[PDB]
Paper text:
C. perfringens type G, the causative agent of necrotic enteritis in broilers, produces two glycosyl hydrolase family 18 chitinases, ChiA and ChiB, which display distinct substrate preferences. Whereas ChiB preferentially processes linear substrates such as chitin, ChiA prefers larger and more branched substrates, such as carbohydrates presented by the chicken intestinal mucus. Here, we show via crystal structures of ChiA and ChiB in the apo and ligand-bound forms that the two enzymes display structural features that explain their substrate preferences providing a structural blueprint for further interrogation of their function and inhibition. We succeeded in obtaining several crystal structures of recombinant ChiA and ChiB in apo (unbound) and ligand-bound forms to resolutions between 1.30 Å and 1.85 Å.
The -2 and -1 positions, where the product disaccharide is bound, are also the location where the inhibitor Bisdionin C binds. The inhibitor molecule forces D194 into its resting conformation where it engages D192 in a low-barrier hydrogen bond as the other conformation would cause steric clashes. A second low occupancy or highly disordered Bisdionin C molecule might be bound in the vicinity of W257, more towards the CBD. Bisdionin C is known to target bacterial GH18 enzymes but could result in unspecific targeting.
Author numbering: 47 to 609
Amino acid sequence: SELNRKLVGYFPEWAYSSEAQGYFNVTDLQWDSLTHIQYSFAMVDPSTNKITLSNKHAAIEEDFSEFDLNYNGKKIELDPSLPYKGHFNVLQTMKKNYPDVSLLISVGGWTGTRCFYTMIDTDNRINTFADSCVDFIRKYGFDGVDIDFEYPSSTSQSGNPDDFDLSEPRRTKLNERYNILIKTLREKIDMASKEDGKEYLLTAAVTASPWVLGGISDNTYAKYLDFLSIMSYDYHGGWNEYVEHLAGIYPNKEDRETVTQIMPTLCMDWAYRYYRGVLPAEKILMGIPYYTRGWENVQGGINGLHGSSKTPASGKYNILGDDLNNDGVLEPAGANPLWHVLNLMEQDPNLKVYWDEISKVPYVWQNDKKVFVSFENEKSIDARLEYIQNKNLGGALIWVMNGDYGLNPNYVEGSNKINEGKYTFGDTLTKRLSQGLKKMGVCNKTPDDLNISLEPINVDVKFNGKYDHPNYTYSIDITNYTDKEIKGGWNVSFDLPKSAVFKSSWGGTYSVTDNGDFNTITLTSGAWQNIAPNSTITVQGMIGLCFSGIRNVTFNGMNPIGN
Ligand SMILES: Cn1cnc2c1c(=O)n(CCCn1c(=O)c3c(ncn3C)n(C)c1=O)c(=O)n2C
């Protein structure tokens, strides 16, 4: 069951009352196609350090009397035997007909990370928080917890700027404290599973940004997750001038933002390689967007792509723009659900779709207004399915379920109103993903690292280092716990994820051997580097770019098992 493909979708609790979000509610979820639903969002309470609802009314109070609850054709009523209403009642009611769809509570997000920073400060607060997550999933009938901390990184000025007053003083410890948080959550959730006779999950949606990842020194937390979802989107957008893809799959040497870097990093496949240092592919999900970002008055490029713009797209090209002063004026971002872009194309024959065969995503270009918007369509879904099969990925995580498309019951020919176009939300791309995940079958089990099958040696190999972008300076400490000197000329090897490039060994000699998602690095010492019994020797060198961890460490062709 753990090797089954996963199709996980985010449910936005705010959508049901919002025109731009299509008034999407729980009965509009793609229940026949999703395997898991992530409810967005819970957060951490500032005073109690417990999990808390963000919109309590939506989650547990709303009766939907002013909204339409129906699935397929059948009216859906709230279950009156439950002690809560809201989206959570509808979720439980639907799950009775879809008992194998797993429900996860997502905690955090871009605007819900703030109180994580203080909660992680002490072990007793982490314990209180983890206990409260167990209480919450029991109370509201959830199957697990998804942690969306943006971001547990030492990178200065990462995460939401509104939280710098909390994150900046904590940068040096955030990664260590996050690792304790995830481990403690796993411990408490596994105990609850045993007590309740139910298999609860713990997952995380994690950064794909090399800038953020340069400040992440320990990815051990990943081993405690049922799956790790890479947020392989938001690679590009109106925060800078580079008119480039939101969510490319493959590395693109023409991405102008990274054209001088060691390799192109702003694509799913780079993050896949990064995370292979700590996880097998079958525990990694691809992030897929059902939203866009974009620019207007684009200069240069070809059909906008690889051009430049200091003006993110606005107006009818930005219906999901943020309203930060709550005045109706939206911040330009070129942000739309997919169905709205389809409706714009129905109205404008000069808003045209193009395909990038390198990145394997589509984009939309208006050649008169010079508007470029990212896009996602059947062709990119098919390319993503091919990637999932080729890489043995666990599946996909979708932000966000009201952005898929289908035909609109409220269509009015000739109307420009947001919810009167040919299309509204639907299940077209999600069903296509589900069908493809069914067709390819279950994941394979990735074999264990080969080192554990080798003969053991009582040598400890400890890999550490420091990252100063783009350079990782490593230090390997080798301790001889045998009773005989180890002569110089010994070798150590390790597998380095292909998110990074080995550059130099500072002493001795080295070789680099292709090994799948890794390069095997073999460091051969000089004859003078003898290791006395109970002694430690250190070697250093440099690697370009970052990686989640190293694997498959060997020493003199044996498995170094320490003391
Ligand atoms: C964890 N995660 C994974 N992918 C994500 C996120 C995430 O937090 N956000 C940022 C989400 C911002 N947001 C909103 O847009 C939002 C909202 N309430 C009303 N809206 C309109 N909340 C509570 C919120 O947090 C994303 O945009 N994506 C792609």
